[PDB]
Structures are given as C-alpha cells and as structure tokens.
Amino acid sequence: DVTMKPLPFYEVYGELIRPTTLFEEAHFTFALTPQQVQQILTSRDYTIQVQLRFCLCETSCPQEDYFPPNLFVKVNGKLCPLPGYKRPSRPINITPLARLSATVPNTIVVNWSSRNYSLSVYLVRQLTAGTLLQKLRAKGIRNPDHSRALIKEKLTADPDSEVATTSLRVSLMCPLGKMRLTVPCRALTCAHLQSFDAALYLQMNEKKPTWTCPVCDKKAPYESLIIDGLFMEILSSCSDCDEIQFMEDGSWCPM
C-alpha cells in the first residue's frame, strides 16, 4: 500500500479517503461525522481542516506531496484553487469548499494527464510554530562534541594544499532575523557550522513552507533539524559579541 509522509504543521485526526490510485478524470466521495463537523466549526480560517493530498503511486517509502501533470481539482462542483507558478506540490486545504454537514456527501472530481498517481483526504489540526518549536526543543540538544569534531575536521590542513584554513568564523546572530540566536539550529545535512534561529525559521515555514536553509539554500526539512550543543554553551558564556573565531587548538574568541 501507499502512505503519505507526515506534514510538520499537521496532525492527522482521521482519514476521510484512504490513499487511492488515480485528459484523465476520476470521481471521489466522502462524508463527515457530526463530531468531525463540530470539531471543524468550533475551530475558529479553521484550525481543524479537510486536507486533500496527492503523491506518486509508490510503496517503498512514505510519500511526499506530488501533483500529477495538468492537475485541475473540483470540490463539490466548485473549482479548487492550487498553488501558483512549474507548480509546487503541496497539501490542499479544501475546508472552504467542503460541505460542513453530516447529512450530505462531499464530492471531488480530479483531472490530470498520464506513471500512476495517488489521492488521499484527511481531517487534520493545523499546529502553530510555537507548538512545533516546543516539539523540536523536546527532541533535545545535539552533543557539543559533534560540532567540536566538525571544527577540528575543517581546520585539519590537507597535506597536498597550499592555502590552509587556520581559523573558522561563525556569527551568534541569526542570518535570517539579524537578532542574537535563542535556539541555534541547523539541518543534519548542512555542511556549514553557521546556525539559524529555530523559532524564527518555524515562524517563516508556518506561513510559506519551503523548508530551505537561510544559510546555504539546501533543503532543511523539519525532521532533519538539530539544536547545536556547542552554540548553546557559547550563547550562555559570551555577551557583547556578534562573531566568534575558532582555532585548531580548540580555543575560541571574538572575531
């Protein structure tokens, strides 16, 4: 079977349409229970939503959102708006077009051109950046020795090299927000030592979810994020300072 990869800002409450294989046309139907209708209507933009998701019809791993080509969706006979322009594949909030009643069915008509694709619908709670931050801080702090070993590595001179890096420089300020770091974080896959502010980075992806490193522009998914232990200890010792300089001998001082 096909499963979707969980979204960091969405907690699945129920599955309304299980992942189902898709100028082609396919018709879908689903119903909400009175309890599910009550959850939506009392969630104030609603915080409990109906989420439509598309992906590749692949089984080896949980799938990320992937729109089929020439996608055009109709929810309850009404044209469903998609992300602007190539078009980025993302979950679709169909709550504004949903029939928020237990007494009537909801209809989805999908048009695309032919690889196989899959469609699924979920009842979700949209989480805040604050909640996602607390979930991140709950995974703990990365060993400060992991950064110390990375610093040592980068300052280890290549023997068949003329120009050798004798010292590294990092900032204690966020490269995105310009204020001093509170939660210094980075993706595990990033090669650089420069961290960015975790709270600010989640505040940004709450609105527009690009999950892109503000330092190197590589992918920085939520599930790859760590809190640098070394920068956590420095942020506690250091005071009137912007940039730190690291030596080979392990020492550090202002830059």
Site for Zn ion in 211-240 (CB under 5 A): 213, 215-216
Strand order in the sheet with 252-254: 167-171, 243-247, 252-254
213 contact choice in Zn ion, Cl ion, none (CB below 5 to 8 Å, kind-dependent): Zn ion
Can you give the binding site for Cl ion, defined by CB under 5 A?
Answer: 142-143
Has 27 been labeled as part of a binding site? Answer: no
Looking at the chain, after which residues does the C atom sit over 2.5 Å from the next written N, breaking the chain? 22, 44, 85, 114
245 binds, among Zn ion, Cl ion, none (CB under 5 to 8 A by kind): none
Query: What is the C-alpha to C-alpha distance for residues 58 and 248, in angstroms, rounded to an integer?
Result: 47
Cα distances (angstroms) measured from residue 232 to each of 3, 143, 227? 37, 10, 8
Q: Using CB under 5 A, pick the residue from 190, 204, 225, 230 that binds Zn ion.
A: 190
Coil, strand or helix at 10: strand
Between 24 and 223, CB nearer to Cl ion: 223
Question: DSSP code of 46?
Answer: -
The answer to whether 210 and 118 are in contact (CB under 8 A) is: no
55 vs 230 by CB, closer to Cl ion = 230
CA 120 to chain CA centroid, nearest Å: 19
253 annotated to a ligand binding site: no
Smallest gap from Cβ 186 to Zn ion, in A, equals 6
φ, ψ (nearest 5 deg) of residue 124 = -130, 160
Which CB, 109 or 235, lies closer to Cl ion? Answer: 235
Is 241 part of any known ligand binding site? no
- Choose the contact partner of 119 out of Zn ion, Cl ion, none; CB within 5 to 8 A by kind: none
Q: What is the DSSP letter of 240?
A: S
> Please, what is the minimum distance in Å from the beta carbon of residue 142 to Cl ion?
4
Q: Which is nearer to Zn ion, 25 or 243 (CB)?
A: 243
Cβ atoms 109, 30 nearer than 8 A: no
Cα separation, 112 vs 145, whole angstroms: 51
**Residue (94 or 215) nearer to Zn ion, CB:** 215
Residue nearest Cl ion, CB atom distance: 143
The interface mask with Zn ion, positions 145-184, x = CB under 5 A, is: ----------------------------------------
Residues in contact with Zn ion by the rule CB under 5 A: 190, 213, 215-216
Binding-site residues: 190, 192, 213, 216
Which residues are annotated as part of the binding site for Zn(2+)? 190, 192, 213, 216
